[PDB]
Amino acid sequence: PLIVPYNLPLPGGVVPRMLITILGTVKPNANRIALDFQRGNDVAFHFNPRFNENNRRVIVCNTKLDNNWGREERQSVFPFESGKPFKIQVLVEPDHFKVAVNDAHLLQYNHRVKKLNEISKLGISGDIDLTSASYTMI
């Protein structure tokens, strides 16, 4: 098991065909999970499941530039369940990050931060037990 929050270095940044795989279990009373692909202090892609946002479950995605959050992209399809094991796969494609959860396509997020090679770390945080975090080329 891995300590949360966990930093996964992405050597030389991301590139199309890189596949990041995160395995863990949602804690029983979870409130949030976050994945943050970073370019220094900037957050190129924030993927943020929220378990009780005004009694709704929603995934919020966004980018943080110069300490300011941008326009949120919201997904109501919510494949995470409190107490249960999950797999998140993030596939870097030329124009977007493509995300699958438990082998099912969830969402795509268009690149706002376009210097892919400078997105050099992934932060994994929130209400999870983290089992594995790795990457490969496909």
From Swiss-Prot:
Residues 6-136 form the Galectin domain. GO terms for biological process: eosinophil chemotaxis; epithelial cell differentiation; innate immune response; macrophage chemotaxis; monocyte chemotaxis; mononuclear cell migration; mRNA processing; negative regulation of endocytosis. Keywords: Acetylation, Cytoplasm, Differentiation, Disulfide bond, IgE-binding protein, Immunity, Innate immunity, Lectin, mRNA processing, mRNA splicing, Nucleus, Phosphoprotein, Repeat, Secreted, Spliceosome. The keyword Ribosomal protein does not apply. GO terms for molecular function: carbohydrate binding; chemoattractant activity; disaccharide binding; IgE binding; laminin binding; molecular condensate scaffold activity; protein phosphatase binding; protein phosphatase inhibitor activity. A beta-D-galactoside binds at W69, G70, R71, E72, E73, R74, Q75. Galactose-specific lectin which binds IgE. May mediate with the alpha-3, beta-1 integrin the stimulation by CSPG4 of endothelial cells migration. Together with DMBT1, required for terminal differentiation of columnar epithelial cells during early embryogenesis. In the nucleus: acts as a pre-mRNA splicing factor. Involved in acute inflammatory responses including neutrophil activation and adhesion, chemoattraction of monocytes macrophages, opsonization of apoptotic neutrophils, and activation of mast cells. This is Galectin-3. It comes from Homo sapiens. The chain holds residues 113 to 250 of 250 of the full protein.
